[PDB]
């Protein structure tokens, strides 16, 4: 119910506050829906479900120099298409469940 700010149309569906241990099994079975559909080999973003917090937002990489400097390179995804397709299915489920 906290975390990242996506438009959530499924919201009256009762769901408890997902902690980091429970967001693993959500994130693991979503990246297992891309390895079954597109049949990739190798990691394909599943690393995000085996350690650390799965509620990732704005993934970024940085290096800390010794002289008190840190170069964050924020890499966000550009246009997203399946998520644009998912948000219309998720807003049709609340219309016709």
């Amino acid at each position: 119910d906290a975390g990242f700010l996506v438009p959530r149309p499924l919201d009256a569906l009762r769901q408890f506050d997902v902690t980091s241990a429970a967001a693993a099994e959500i994130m693991h079975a979503v990246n297992d829906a891309f390895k079954t559909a597109f049949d990739l080999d190798g990691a394909l973003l599943d690393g995000l479900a085996l350690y650390g917090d799965p509620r990732i937002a704005d993934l970024s990489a940085a290096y800390l120099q010794y002289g008190g400097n840190v170069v964050r390179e924020h890499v966000p995804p550009g246009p997203s298409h399946i998520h644009r397709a998912l948000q219309q299915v998720e807003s049709t489920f609340m219309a016709e469940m």
């Binding site: 937002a57 704005d58 993934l59 970024s60 990489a61 120099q65 010794y66 964050r72 924020h74």
Partner: protein, 49 residues
């Protein structure tokens, strides 16, 4: 200016609820330190036509 660490942040550190530095922070150097033999590099530096 010599780089000390390389960190991957799932969420930028101003907004993450509980600090979770990347695990690569724990390593002594800033990457996977494979050792190399300097007496094997120095053969390929002095020979090699």
């Amino acid at each position: 200016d010599v780089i000390t660490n390389v960190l991957v942040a799932r969420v930028d550190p101003a907004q993450r609820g509980d600090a979770a530095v990347d695990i690569r922070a724990t390593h002594a150097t800033f990457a996977a330190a494979l050792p190399v033999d300097p007496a094997a590099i120095v053969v390929a530096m002095l020979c090699g036509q």
